[PDB]
Design an enzyme around this catalytic site. Structure first.
Site, PDB file in Angstrom:
ATOM      1  N   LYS A  59       0.855  -1.171   0.000  1.00  0.00           N
ATOM      2  CA  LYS A  59       0.000   0.000   0.000  1.00  0.00           C
ATOM      3  C   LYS A  59       0.889   1.217   0.000  1.00  0.00           C
ATOM      4  O   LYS A  59       1.762   1.338   0.858  1.00  0.00           O
ATOM      5  CB  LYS A  59      -0.910   0.001   1.214  1.00  0.00           C
ATOM      6  N   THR A  60       0.650   2.086  -0.985  1.00  0.00           N
ATOM      7  CA  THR A  60       1.466   3.278  -1.215  1.00  0.00           C
ATOM      8  C   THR A  60       0.669   4.540  -0.853  1.00  0.00           C
ATOM      9  O   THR A  60      -0.552   4.561  -0.891  1.00  0.00           O
ATOM     10  CB  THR A  60       1.905   3.386  -2.692  1.00  0.00           C
ATOM     11  N   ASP A  90      -3.305   4.291  -1.684  1.00  0.00           N
ATOM     12  CA  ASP A  90      -4.276   4.688  -0.644  1.00  0.00           C
ATOM     13  C   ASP A  90      -4.562   6.182  -0.802  1.00  0.00           C
ATOM     14  O   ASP A  90      -4.251   6.996   0.078  1.00  0.00           O
ATOM     15  CB  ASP A  90      -3.635   4.359   0.709  1.00  0.00           C
ATOM     16  N   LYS A  92      -7.651   7.581  -1.229  1.00  0.00           N
ATOM     17  CA  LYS A  92      -8.908   8.019  -0.556  1.00  0.00           C
ATOM     18  C   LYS A  92      -9.607   9.070  -1.418  1.00  0.00           C
ATOM     19  O   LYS A  92      -9.931  10.170  -0.964  1.00  0.00           O
ATOM     20  CB  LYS A  92      -8.645   8.504   0.884  1.00  0.00           C
ATOM     21  N   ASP A  95     -13.965  13.156  -3.939  1.00  0.00           N
ATOM     22  CA  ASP A  95     -14.502  14.353  -4.637  1.00  0.00           C
ATOM     23  C   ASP A  95     -15.680  13.919  -5.516  1.00  0.00           C
ATOM     24  O   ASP A  95     -16.045  12.759  -5.561  1.00  0.00           O
ATOM     25  CB  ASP A  95     -13.359  15.024  -5.456  1.00  0.00           C
ATOM     26  N   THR A  99     -14.374  15.201 -11.034  1.00  0.00           N
ATOM     27  CA  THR A  99     -13.033  15.484 -10.532  1.00  0.00           C
ATOM     28  C   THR A  99     -12.199  14.225 -10.293  1.00  0.00           C
ATOM     29  O   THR A  99     -11.055  14.140 -10.751  1.00  0.00           O
ATOM     30  CB  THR A  99     -13.091  16.325  -9.260  1.00  0.00           C
ATOM     31  N   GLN A 208      -4.854   7.457  15.661  1.00  0.00           N
ATOM     32  CA  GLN A 208      -4.797   6.063  15.213  1.00  0.00           C
ATOM     33  C   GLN A 208      -5.043   5.154  16.419  1.00  0.00           C
ATOM     34  O   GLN A 208      -4.547   5.434  17.509  1.00  0.00           O
ATOM     35  CB  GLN A 208      -3.455   5.760  14.539  1.00  0.00           C
ATOM     36  N   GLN A 209      -5.834   4.114  16.202  1.00  0.00           N
ATOM     37  CA  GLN A 209      -6.108   3.108  17.219  1.00  0.00           C
ATOM     38  C   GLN A 209      -5.757   1.745  16.671  1.00  0.00           C
ATOM     39  O   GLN A 209      -6.026   1.475  15.517  1.00  0.00           O
ATOM     40  CB  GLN A 209      -7.587   3.127  17.570  1.00  0.00           C
ATOM     41  N   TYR A 210      -5.204   0.891  17.512  1.00  0.00           N
ATOM     42  CA  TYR A 210      -4.762  -0.444  17.053  1.00  0.00           C
ATOM     43  C   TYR A 210      -5.549  -1.619  17.630  1.00  0.00           C
ATOM     44  O   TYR A 210      -5.981  -1.572  18.770  1.00  0.00           O
ATOM     45  CB  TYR A 210      -3.270  -0.652  17.361  1.00  0.00           C
TER      46      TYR A 210
HETATM   47  N1  LIG Z   1     -15.171  22.509  -3.129  1.00  0.00           N
HETATM   48  C1  LIG Z   1     -15.530  21.526  -3.554  1.00  0.00           C
HETATM   49  C2  LIG Z   1     -15.972  20.316  -4.078  1.00  0.00           C
HETATM   50  C3  LIG Z   1     -16.868  19.714  -3.249  1.00  0.00           C
HETATM   51  C4  LIG Z   1     -18.197  19.825  -3.492  1.00  0.00           C
HETATM   52  O1  LIG Z   1     -18.996  19.495  -2.597  1.00  0.00           O
HETATM   53  N2  LIG Z   1     -18.567  19.996  -4.722  1.00  0.00           N
HETATM   54  C5  LIG Z   1     -17.688  20.326  -5.678  1.00  0.00           C
HETATM   55  O2  LIG Z   1     -18.083  20.475  -6.836  1.00  0.00           O
HETATM   56  N3  LIG Z   1     -16.355  20.505  -5.329  1.00  0.00           N
HETATM   57  C6  LIG Z   1     -15.359  20.944  -6.354  1.00  0.00           C
HETATM   58  O3  LIG Z   1     -15.726  22.253  -6.857  1.00  0.00           O
HETATM   59  C7  LIG Z   1     -15.525  22.251  -8.273  1.00  0.00           C
HETATM   60  C8  LIG Z   1     -16.902  22.249  -8.931  1.00  0.00           C
HETATM   61  O4  LIG Z   1     -16.691  22.481 -10.344  1.00  0.00           O
HETATM   62  P1  LIG Z   1     -17.884  22.751 -11.393  1.00  0.00           P
HETATM   63  O5  LIG Z   1     -18.395  24.099 -10.994  1.00  0.00           O
HETATM   64  O6  LIG Z   1     -18.872  21.631 -11.192  1.00  0.00           O
HETATM   65  O7  LIG Z   1     -17.144  22.601 -12.692  1.00  0.00           O
HETATM   66  C9  LIG Z   1     -14.744  20.995  -8.638  1.00  0.00           C
HETATM   67  O8  LIG Z   1     -13.301  21.288  -8.705  1.00  0.00           O
HETATM   68  C10 LIG Z   1     -15.102  20.019  -7.544  1.00  0.00           C
HETATM   69  O9  LIG Z   1     -14.017  19.116  -7.314  1.00  0.00           O
HETATM   70  O1  LIG Z   2      -9.028   3.968   8.383  1.00  0.00           O
HETATM   71  C1  LIG Z   2      -7.833   4.020   8.024  1.00  0.00           C
HETATM   72  C2  LIG Z   2      -7.553   4.167   6.693  1.00  0.00           C
HETATM   73  C3  LIG Z   2      -6.254   4.195   6.280  1.00  0.00           C
HETATM   74  N1  LIG Z   2      -5.246   4.083   7.115  1.00  0.00           N
HETATM   75  C4  LIG Z   2      -3.872   4.082   6.558  1.00  0.00           C
HETATM   76  O2  LIG Z   2      -3.170   2.867   6.906  1.00  0.00           O
HETATM   77  C5  LIG Z   2      -1.865   3.163   7.430  1.00  0.00           C
HETATM   78  C6  LIG Z   2      -1.795   2.951   8.945  1.00  0.00           C
HETATM   79  O3  LIG Z   2      -0.419   2.744   9.299  1.00  0.00           O
HETATM   80  P1  LIG Z   2       0.181   2.409  10.791  1.00  0.00           P
HETATM   81  O4  LIG Z   2      -0.742   3.081  11.719  1.00  0.00           O
HETATM   82  O5  LIG Z   2       0.150   0.889  10.754  1.00  0.00           O
HETATM   83  O6  LIG Z   2       1.547   3.033  10.638  1.00  0.00           O
HETATM   84  C7  LIG Z   2      -1.599   4.596   7.025  1.00  0.00           C
HETATM   85  O7  LIG Z   2      -0.940   4.674   5.747  1.00  0.00           O
HETATM   86  C8  LIG Z   2      -2.975   5.217   6.999  1.00  0.00           C
HETATM   87  O8  LIG Z   2      -3.006   6.381   6.139  1.00  0.00           O
HETATM   88  C9  LIG Z   2      -5.561   3.909   8.475  1.00  0.00           C
HETATM   89  O9  LIG Z   2      -4.674   3.795   9.318  1.00  0.00           O
HETATM   90  N2  LIG Z   2      -6.831   3.890   8.888  1.00  0.00           N
END
Ligand SMILES: N#Cc1cc(=O)[nH]c(=O)n1[C@@H]1O[C@H](COP(=O)(O)O)[C@@H](O)[C@H]1O
Ligand SMILES: O=c1ccn([C@@H]2O[C@H](COP(=O)(O)O)[C@@H](O)[C@H]2O)c(=O)[nH]1
Lengths: 257, 257
Positions: A59-60, A90, A92, A95, A99, A208-210
């Site tokens: 995981k990167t 990773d 996440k 948007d 986007t 973070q929780q383990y």
């Molecule tokens: N901020 C933000 C974000 C969250 C949201 O709830 N709704 C959005 O459209 N955005 C962003 O606002 C821009 C909306 O662009 P447009 O006006 O739909 O072309 C995008 O860059 C989108 O990623």
């Molecule tokens: O709910 C989540 C989602 C993702 N990560 C990711 O997993 C790794 C946790 O690493 P460590 O706490 O084992 O170092 C991190 O890269 C973190 O961004 C979490 O810890 N919890």
């Protein structure tokens, strides 16, 4: 009744990426994903090569690499093919659909060009998956939806979690499972990956929780543990990776009976 | 009591980045944030220069820029200083605290070095804010929490939104406002920025939904409109920005009294 990872890899509705993963998990007796949270490309590649035998997945976070280039990812792919593990970025994604499609395919990172798996938060609604899948489906990729989080104060609970499960179910051509703390879907085609894992009880200073591999795999029914600091901060990372692998693997075997 | 942007810039509890923004909104008669959703640095900069006098803020997605470098951001800062607007990177930080600190400070983008504002999802719990603040505090940066989203099926509603507002209140040293569809806090020190804005009714094919400036600023009580395609897709982006500026500004004047 529980199926083995190798039997799950053969399920009619299994996604090809999930099948690849499940087959190598069974072949290598590993359900460990290394969280390679480092700032240098050489560190990423060094850990990937050394620990690759022990892991099903790497995981990167490419956005924390001080020296990212696409050649780094070409080389990581060679290592992934050699040692037999998938690459999970990773990112996440969180948007609107229009986007995230650009964030997945384009920019400097070109994530879809090298990551077997990515993940997405469900908070924007299903358009986040629709946007990603427009790029990921042609490129034979999979996605994990974040159904629960390991951190203190997480809002990914209750009805939010159920929404993530519904979204995955309705987008199974692309979504292969979940980031979660426990089994959240009863369908065996979906993978469950759990971060927030260490052998010892604790947390960090930023929420973070383990929980242990036995707890998460054995009692909570997850498939794969995601372990970062538990391995990377150890003096001997190879021995630590093997300890986590053996722990997760035995927890799986016990559950399976 | 409805205060002008210039008065709000002087509020006792106002964050200095919010104060700088509100001052320039008042000076330039603009509550328009341009969402510069382009893939080319030259187009980004050309838009920044031409539209700079019309906007209070330029919102970036640096991870979609095919030719990002820190030298591009240096030129953007030069234009931001010249024309007087803030730079907002719409990164939507959404990870555990320990991870987001690195994603904010480091990597190739070094976002904290150039962005006046960033935003964060609240789903991970307050660790997301604590991690970003460790970086943003000495650099005099600010953060916006995503309390609501514009997209179909958004889960940022009800208690989720209330949790976002509580988190902002508890971290007012760094959190300067919200991404929302309407006014979500009654504290005038907080900015409300609203995306999903176009002059015409409609949406896109991936879950985006649009409301007008008059609706969002006038009736829903938001402060700033974030406009991407309604401007970027126009033949003449300057004329389009001027349309949005005047719409949003006059809507604001109307609720003032
Ligand atoms: N901020 C933000 C974000 C969250 C949201 O709830 N709704 C959005 O459209 N955005 C962003 O606002 C821009 C909306 O662009 P447009 O006006 O739909 O072309 C995008 O860059 C989108 O990623
Ligand atoms: O709910 C989540 C989602 C993702 N990560 C990711 O997993 C790794 C946790 O690493 P460590 O706490 O084992 O170092 C991190 O890269 C973190 O961004 C979490 O810890 N919890």
């Amino acid at each position: 009744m529980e199926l083995s990872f190798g039997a799950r890899a053969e399920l009619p509705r299994i996604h090809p990426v999930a099948s690849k993963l499940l087959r190598l998990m069974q072949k290598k007796e590993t359900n460990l994903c290394l969280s390679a949270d480092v700032s240098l490309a050489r560190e990423l590649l060094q850990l990937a090569d050394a620990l690759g035998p022990s892991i099903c997945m790497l995981k990167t976070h490419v956005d924390i690499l001080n020296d990212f280039t696409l050649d780094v990812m070409k080389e990581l792919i060679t290592l992934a093919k050699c040692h037999e593990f998938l690459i999970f970025e990773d990112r996440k994604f969180a948007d609107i659909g229009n986007t995230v499609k650009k964030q997945y395919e384009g920019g400097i990172f070109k994530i879809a060009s090298w990551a077997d798996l990515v993940n997405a938060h469900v908070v924007p609604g299903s358009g986040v998956v629709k946007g990603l899948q427009e790029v990921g489906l042609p490129l034979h990729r999979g996605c994990l939806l974040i159904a629960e989080m390991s951190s203190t104060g997480s809002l990914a609970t209750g009805d939010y979690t159920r929404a993530a499960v519904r979204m995955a179910e309705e987008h199974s051509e692309f979504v292969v499972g979940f980031i979660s703390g426990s089994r959240v879907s009863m369908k065996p085609e979906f993978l469950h990956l759990t971060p927030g894992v260490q052998l010892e009880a604790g947390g960090d200073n930023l929420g973070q929780q383990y929980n242990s591999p036995q707890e998460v795999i054995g009692k909570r029914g997850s498939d794969i543990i995601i372990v970062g600091r538990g391995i990377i901060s150890a003096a001997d990372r190879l021995e630590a990776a093997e300890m986590y692998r053996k722990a997760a693997w035995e927890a799986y075997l016990s559950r399976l009976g």
